[PDB]
Amino acid sequence: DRQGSKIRTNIVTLQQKDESTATDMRELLKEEPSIDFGGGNGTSQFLTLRGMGQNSVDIKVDNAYSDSQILYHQGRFIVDPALVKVVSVQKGAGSASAGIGATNGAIIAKTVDAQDLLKGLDKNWGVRLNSGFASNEGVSYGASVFGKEGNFDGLFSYNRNDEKEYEAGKGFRNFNGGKTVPYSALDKRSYLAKIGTTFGDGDHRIVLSHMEDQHRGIRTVREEFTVPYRETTQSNTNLAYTGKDLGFVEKLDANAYVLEKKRYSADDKDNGYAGNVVGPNHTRITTRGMNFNFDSRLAEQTLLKYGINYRHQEIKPQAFLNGEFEISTDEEKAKDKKDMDLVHSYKLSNPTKTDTGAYIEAIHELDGFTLTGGLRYDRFKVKTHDGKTVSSSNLNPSFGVIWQPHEHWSFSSSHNYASRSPRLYDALQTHGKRGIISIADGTKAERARNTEIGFNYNDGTFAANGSYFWQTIKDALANPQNAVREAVNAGYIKNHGYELGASYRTGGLTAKVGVSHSKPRFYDTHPKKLLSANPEFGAQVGRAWTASLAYRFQNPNLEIGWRGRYVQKAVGSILVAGQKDRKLENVVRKGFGVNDVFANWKPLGKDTLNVNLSVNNVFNTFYYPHSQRWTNTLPGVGRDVRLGVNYKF
C-alpha cells in the first residue's frame, strides 16, 4: 500500500476474520473511519465512503458488480463476510485500469479458496465447522469442505445466520414500547461452490464459481424505516482466468460473470412501489460482464497495461403495470386525465444498459520513483423502459506518482478522471404503475476529477498514513425532469477531506488510531432542483475516530482487546441548496461513542481452532449512525454479546 489512505488492500484477511465475532461488513470494518454504515439489518443499511453513498461506490466481489438497485428506500445488497477471503478498499476516482464507473471508490472482496481454508492444516483436504451466538440476538453456523488434488482445487461452503429483532441502546422505545427494532430479523443464507484448476506447468489458472447470498424474513415496504415475507438474493456465476508468460503478454487476467439480484415478495398488495401486486411478486436484475486485462513489459521496469470492460444490465419485473397508472381539492383535473391517457398508452419493455471500456495504462519505475499514466475510453448505451435509447462516450485520462526515497517512507499523488453512466431507475418500480421514466436527449455520464496527496510510513514497529483528497463531479444525475419523467444531468458534486491512520506494534501489543472527515456537497444547476438528499448519494458524516488496543498472551494463546468508534456531531445536508421534508430541513446529527471488547482464544495454539468472545457496544449506547436519513430512522445495535467458534480439521 503506497497511496496514503487511498487504497487499503487486505483491510481484513481470513485469518483475521476467524478471530472476530462479526457476521456482517458493518462490524468487520468498524475500525475503518472513512466507511460508515447505516443502522438496521440487511439492506436496511446504506454505505458511505468518504461521505459518498452506494449510488457511486460499488461493492465488487470477484470483480463483478452492478450499479442498479431494487428501491431507493433500501441500501444496495452488501455481501456476507462468511464467503470472503479478503476485503480491500479503493477511494475516489481510480486509474485507467480500475474498471467501469470508478468515480468514487469501491469495497472489493474476493471469495474464499480451498488454499485459504487449507492454511492451518497438515494435509490437502479439510472440513471447517463454525457456530456463533449473539445475545442481541441471533445464532449462526456454517460448514465447509475443500481440498487440492494435483492441480485441482475445490471448495463447497454453506453458512446460515438467523437473526431475531435486535434491541437498541438504553432509552430507545418501540412504537409499542418495546426495546427491539421491529422487522429487523433476517434469516441469511449463503453458499459458495468453487472449482479450480492450474495447468501449463503452473502458469495458468481457471476458476469457476457459484455463489448465493440470501436474506429472508418479514420486512417493511421501506427497509430504511421501522413501524409480508420477503426474499432478497444475490447470485454470482463467475469464471476467472489467470495466465502468465504468453509471449508478448506478461500477464492476462480475465473474468466472465452473470450476476443476479432477485426480490421475491409473498404478497405485495400493500406495497405501492411494487405496484400493489396481489400475491407473489418477483423482481429480477441480471448483469453480465467480462473483463480482459493485459500486461506487456516494455523495459525492465516499465509495464504497459491495456484491456477491455463489458457490462450488460437488464431489469425484468414480473409484469408491467402502467395501465393501472392513476393520479389523485381540485378544479383543473382536465390535465390529469390527458396524462393517464398518455401513460396507459405506453408499451413498456425491460430497461437495459451496456457499459463498454478500453483503457491503456503505463507504469514506469526508476530508483524509487513510480509514474503511472493512463487513458480510458468509456462508452454507455441506456435503454429505458419505453424503448428510448441514448448513448455517450468519454475519454478519461489519469496519472499518479509514487515516490519512495527511503525504505520506511512513501509519498503519493494522483489526478484521475473517471466517468459513470446514469443508473437505471429502481428495479421495483420498473413496471411503471407510478409513471414513465425516460432519459433526456444527449444526457451524459457523470464525470469525476479526483486529485489526492498521501504518504505512508512504516518501520515495522510504528506505522502511519494519511491522505487529502479533492473531488469534482460534473453532470451529476439524481431525479428525472418532466408523468413521463426523464433522467437528466442536473448539477455537480464537490468533495474534499482527509484521513490519517497510525499504529504501534511491540511484542503482542497492537495499538491503532484513525480519523476521517469529508465534506460531500451536491450543487443544483437545474431550475426544478433535481438533486437528491437520499443516503444512496451520500451523507455528511461527522468526523469519525477509531482506535483499538489489543494484547496477545503467549500462554495460553489468547488476545484481548478494546475497540472504539467515535463520531462527532454533524450538521448540514449533502445538498448545497438544502434538503426538504413534505420546508427546508435544518440537518443536525448527534455524535456518539461506541466501545467494544473482544477476545480471541486458540486452544490448540494454532489457527485451526478459534474461540471468540466479544461484547459490542459495552455501554449500551443509544444512537443513530449518520449514513442514513437524519430523522431517527434506525438506531444502532445496543449491547451485544457474542460467542463464536470456528474449527478446521
Which residues have a Cβ under 8 Å from the Cβ of 322 and sit 6 or more positions away? 343, 344, 346, 348, 431, 432, 433, 436
User: Which residue ranges does the chain devote to CATH 2.170.130.10?
Assistant: 1-111
Instruction: Say which CATH class 1-111 falls into.
Output: mainly beta
Displacement of CA 226 from its chain's centroid (Å): 23
For 108-122, b where at least 16 C-beta lie within 10 A, e where not — what string?
bbbbbbbebbbbbbe
Burial 124-145 (b: 16+ CB within 10 A, else e): eebebebebebebbbebbbebe
Distances 576 to 488, 517, 553, 614, 633 between C-alpha atoms, Å: 19, 18, 52, 41, 23
Experimentally, the structure was elucidated by X-ray
Q: Where in the chain is the domain with CATH 2.40.170.20?
A: 112-649
Say if CB 143 and CB 129 are below 8 A apart.
Answer: yes
Resolution, given in Å to one decimal, reads: 2.3
Amino acid identity of residue 588, one-letter, is V
* Phi, then psi, of 546 in degrees rounded to 5: -135, 155
The answer to whether the peptide bond before residue 137 is cis (omega within 30 degrees of 0) is yes
DSSP one-letter code for 423: P
Backbone dihedral angles phi then psi of residue 83, each to the nearest 5 degrees? -80, -20
Cβ–Cβ < 8 Å for 99, 67 = no
Contact 480, 489 (CB under 8 A): no
Alpha-carbon distance 98 to 291, whole Å?
11
- What DSSP letter does each residue of 201-232 carry, written as one string? GGTEEEEEEEEEEEEEEE--SSTT----EEEE
Q: Which of 580, 475, 589, 485 is nearest to 522 (CA)?
A: 475
Where is the chain discontinuous (C–N over 2.5 Å), named by the preceding residue? 227, 328, 482, 582
As given in the structure block, the three cell numbers for residue 83 are: 464467503
Q: How far apart are the first and last CA of the chain?
A: 34
Residue 341, all three cell numbers: 391517457
3-state helix, strand, coil in the chain (%, to 5): 5, 55, 40
Angle, vertex CA 476, rays to CA 472 and CA 479, nearest 5: 155
Q: Residue 231 and residue 266: Cα distance in Å, rounded? A: 8
Which amino acid type is present at position 6?
Answer: K
> Is CATH 3.30.70.890 the classification given to domain 112-649?
no
405 preceded by a cis bond (ω within 30 of 0): no
